[PDB]
Amino acid sequence: ATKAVCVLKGDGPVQGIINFEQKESNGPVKVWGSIKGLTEGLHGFHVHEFGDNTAGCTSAGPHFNPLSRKHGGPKDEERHVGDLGNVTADKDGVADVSIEDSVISLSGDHCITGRTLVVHEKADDLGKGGNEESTKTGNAGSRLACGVIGIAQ
Amino acid sequence: ATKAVCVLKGDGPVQGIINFEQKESNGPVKVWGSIKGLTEGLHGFHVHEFGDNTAGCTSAGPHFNPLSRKHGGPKDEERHVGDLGNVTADKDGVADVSIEDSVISLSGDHCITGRTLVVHEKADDLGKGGNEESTKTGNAGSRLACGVIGIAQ
Ligand SMILES: NCCc1ccc(O)c(O)c1
Ligand SMILES: [Cu+2]
Numbered sequence: 541a542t543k544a545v546c547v548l549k550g551d552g553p554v555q556g557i558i559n560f561e562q563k564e565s566n567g568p569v570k571v572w573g574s575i576k577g578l579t580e581g582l583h584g585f586h587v588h589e590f591g592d593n594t595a596g597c598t599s600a601g602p603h604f605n606p607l608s609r610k611h612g613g614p615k616d617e618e619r620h621v622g623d624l625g626n627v628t629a630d631k632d633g634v635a636d637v638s639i640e641d642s643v644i645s646l647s648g649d650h651c652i653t654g655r656t657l658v659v660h661e662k663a664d665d666l667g668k669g670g671n672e673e674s675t676k677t678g679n680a681g682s683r684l685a686c687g688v689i690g691i692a693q
Numbered sequence: 694a695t696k697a698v699c700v701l702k703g704d705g706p707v708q709g710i711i712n713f714e715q716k717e718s719n720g721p722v723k724v725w726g727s728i729k730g731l732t733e734g735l736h737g738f739h740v741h742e743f744g745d746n747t748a749g750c751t752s753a754g755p756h757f758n759p760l761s762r763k764h765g766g767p768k769d770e771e772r773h774v775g776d777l778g779n780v781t782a783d784k785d786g787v788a789d790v791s792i793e794d795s796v797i798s799l800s801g802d803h804c805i806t807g808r809t810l811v812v813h814e815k816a817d818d819l820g821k822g823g824n825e826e827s828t829k830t831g832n833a834g835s836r837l838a839c840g841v842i843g844i845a846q
């Protein structure tokens with residue numbers, strides 16, 4: 541198996557740890573871990589193009605989109621490679637993450653390693669919000685925490 | 694042609710930004726930037742194997758060593774791929790980094806993206822120290838600051 545990991549940090553209280561595992565080349569990737577310090581509800585959760593945190597999470601650029609598609613949810617055909625939907629926090633501010641995704645990879649042109657995972661201020665509308673920005677960013681707002689996805693042991 | 698970046702964070706603040714550029718996949722990599730908050734003198738400067746910062750810089754593991762060689766300096770044939778020698782700080786606590794290296798790469802089997810860059814407590818003896826640890830770590834000591842190397846715009 542191939543493994544990767546991301547430590548999420550930002551300027552405020554949001555912090556988390558996310559693990560990735562891919563049993564087979566071109567097979568699905570399991571994504572799991574925890575994020576704390578969040579407001580209750582949905583928070584957009586995406587891989588962004590650049591693994592650049594120079595000036596904070598903004599430096600990571602747009603959603604990772606090697607196929608030049610429109611934004612969607614993880615269960616949509618029309619999506620960016622980086623579109624992992626939302627994490628959902630309870631009243632304690634904790635989101636338990638447990639995702640399987642077949643579009644991201646840990647090798648090849650869909651590889652997310654060396655790119656940035658971001659958790660956002662607001663819900664991602666999964667491209668169903670009915671404005672122009674819905675099919676670009678999902679209207680998920682600012683970036684609360686992020687980290688560069690690294691190769692794991 | 695291909696670019697990467699690393700934000701180094703550790704206590705001091707030991708902080709730094711390091712940029713990487715490779716004009717072609719078969720070519721050398723320029724490494725440049727600044728690190729501040731350092732004690733005057735040499736500090737070992739290496740790419741480590743894993744891009745895992747789960748528990749801090751320790752999680753990054755040993756020097757990146759895809760060819761299973763012994764530790765050396767960047768000019769040596771016998772080196773780890775991740776052996777970038779030392780950065781040298783003045784009394785002002787700043788090291789200016791300007792390295793060109795032909796062994797690291799931003800593609801292929803020697804690709805350093807997704808791995809951790811580390812600045813160390815003490816000097817790297819470039820494998821010339823005459824104890825066993827010299828040929829593994831260069832006797833560079835603890836890990837002051839680190840970051841995961843990411844794909845840049
Ligand atoms: N059922 C084990 C969870 C799991 C682990 C690795 C994977 O690649 C995956 O798709 C799912
Ligand atoms: Cu995002």
Ligand SMILES: [Cu+2]
Pocket residue numbers: 737738739740741756811812813
């Ligand atoms: Cu090191």
Ligand SMILES: [Zn+2]
Pocket residue numbers: 586603610611612619620622623676677678
């Ligand atoms: Zn998207």
Ligand SMILES: [Zn+2]
Pocket residue numbers: 739756763764765772773775776829830831
């Ligand atoms: Zn070494």
